[PDB]
Design a binder for this molecule. Structure first.
Ligand SMILES: NC(=O)c1ccc[n+]([C@@H]2O[C@H](COP(=O)([O-])OP(=O)(O)OC[C@H]3O[C@@H](n4cnc5c(N)ncnc54)[C@H](OP(=O)(O)O)[C@@H]3O)[C@@H](O)[C@H]2O)c1
Ligand SMILES: CCC1=C(C)C(=O)N/C1=C\C1=NC(=C\c2[nH]c(/C=C3\NC(=O)C(C)=C3CC)c(CCC(=O)O)c2C)/C(C)=C1CCC(=O)O
Length: 204
């Protein structure tokens, strides 16, 4: 079973609660963060903190070494500019996984990669193009990859009661950040989504 995990993007909206949940659930968690002041003091704390950048291969390598699995919650916060941060980060993550024998990655992109790809709002198209490059990197890696493709990420409570479909259709177009993190952790204990795209959603 998975015991040790690396989380990328642990200081973001979904990352923070995924990290807290993972520690509370018993995982030994390593995070890569550019700025450690973005980690909280209260609540559950990661076992290991690497300060650095997902665009630096050595930093990623140090974070992936010795892990059982990797969670990817990289994003651009409010920046909608053309970008390759997520896909280049994923390239480094894949190389570090292969260098260290790690074979399980659960990574978040977005439901736009399931929905009609001509239905993306213009201001999200640049970020979505890099999600598509990241998804390609991970699908072509030869590793066990769960693609998590959520709809709008909300702040509703943790429920653990959301629905997961494989095609982008579901009870709603929202998932709470807490439920999304819960689902990323669920993917560590089953192979049933390996090689699949998944759509978590719930009516809150
Ligand atoms: N918002 C929505 O409704 C929605 C819906 C579906 C999919 N998504 C996608 O879901 C994913 C998760 O979104 P989120 O809102 O939880 O993310 P977020 O709040 O944007 O957080 C992005 C995370 O990535 C880290 N990061 C960015 N650049 C990095 C770099 N060069 N090196 C290391 N770490 C870096 C950020 O670190 P810092 O703390 O250092 O900035 C932060 O931890 C994103 O890809 C987003 O596009 C969002
Ligand atoms: C109608 C409800 C709604 C809303 C008021 C939003 O802000 N997004 C949204 C719905 C969705 N956003 C999605 C993806 C998304 N949002 C986002 C963030 C921003 N939206 C913005 O306007 C700005 C500015 C953002 C950046 C700060 C992304 C890039 C993340 C990033 O780079 O920002 C991505 C990818 C997605 C699959 C949705 C369907 C779910 C549904 O309910 O249909």
């Amino acid at each position: 079973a998975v015991k040790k995990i690396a989380i990328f993007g642990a200081t973001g909206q979904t990352g923070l609660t995924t990290l807290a949940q993972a520690v509370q659930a018993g995982y030994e968690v390593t995070v890569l963060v550019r700025d450690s002041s973005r980690l909280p003091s209260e609540g559950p704390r990661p076992a290991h903190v690497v300060v650095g950048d997902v665009l630096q291969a050595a930093d990623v390598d140090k974070t992936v070494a010795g892990q059982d699995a990797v969670i990817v919650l990289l994003g651009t916060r409010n920046d909608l500019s053309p970008t390759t941060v997520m896909s280049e980060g994923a390239r480094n993550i894949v190389a570090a996984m292969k260098a260290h024998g790690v074979d399980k990655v659960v990574a978040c992109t977005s439901a736009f990669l399931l929905w009609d790809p001509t239905k993306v709002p213009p201001r999200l198209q640049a970020v979505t193009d890099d999600h598509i490059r990241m998804h390609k990197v991970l699908r072509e890696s030869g590793l066990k990859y769960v693609a998590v493709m959520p709809p709008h990420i909300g702040d509703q409570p943790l429920t653990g009661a959301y629905t997961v479909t494989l095609d982008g259709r579901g009870p709603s177009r929202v998932i709470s950040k807490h439920d999304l993190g819960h689902f990323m952790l669920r993917c560590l204990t089953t192979d049933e989504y390996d090689g699949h795209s998944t759509y978590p959603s719930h009516q809150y």
